[PDB]
């Protein structure tokens, strides 16, 4: 048995569970909802789409919403992404 | 439309493709391989298992290999994880 402490340089992204819950919430709005970082934009209403964006916990990203209920969509999803409750 | 910069507090892990390619590389060896971080260990020959470890790009993890070709496996996989492939 051999072991080695290594630095992960591979790309990371939202895990499946967190992404699924994100999508479940986003789907309740008619607005298009996207997550964006460094010129890359993914659809927040799709699990695989959300997971394709390279992100790390603690990373800053841009949440975008466009539609009739964009304000509420933004408020609810921003709270979710930042794990805020009450 | 509207937007807001938010901090990702959700859990992240290796993305699907890098994880799949890691496993394809690990599959070339008979040794069992694992990844460990903060008391949690996952089977590195399982894509979903590998993706379940809470990881962010740039963080440290412990790569483990055990079997007949463990030394060779560790070196190849360590290079892959740290993006130092030859």
UniProtKB/Swiss-Prot annotation, chains A, B:
Pfam families linked: PTS-HPr
Domain called HPr: residue spans: 1-85
Phosphoserine modifications at: 46
SUPFAM superfamilies: HPr-like
GO BP terms in the entry: phosphoenolpyruvate-dependent sugar phosphotransferase system
Keywords tagged on the record: Phosphoprotein
Additional remark text: Not phosphorylated by PEP and by enzyme I.
NCBIfam families noted in UniProt: PRK13782.1 (NF010354), PTS_HPr_family (TIGR01003)
Family: Belongs to the HPr family.
Quaternary structure (record): Mixture of monomers and homodimers. Interacts with CcpA as a monomer.
Record function comment: Along with seryl-phosphorylated HPr, phosphorylated Crh is implicated in carbon catabolite repression (CCR) of levanase, inositol dehydrogenase, and beta-xylosidase. Exerts its effect on CCR by interacting with CcpA.
Name of the featured protein: HPr-like protein Crh
Organism of this sequence: Bacillus subtilis (strain 168)
Lineage: Bacteria, Bacillati, Bacillota, Bacilli, Bacillales
């Amino acid at each position: 048995m051999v072991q080695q402490k290594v630095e992960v340089r591979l790309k990371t992204g939202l895990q499946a569970r967190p992404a699924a819950l994100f999508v479940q919430e986003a789907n309740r709005f008619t607005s298009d909802v996207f997550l964006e970082k460094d010129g890359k934009k993914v659809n927040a209403k799709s699990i695989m789409g959300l997971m394709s964006l390279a992100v790390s916990t603690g990373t800053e990203v841009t949440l975008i919403a466009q539609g009739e209920d964009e304000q509420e969509a933004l408020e609810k999803l921003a709270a979710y992404v930042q794990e805020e409750v009450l």
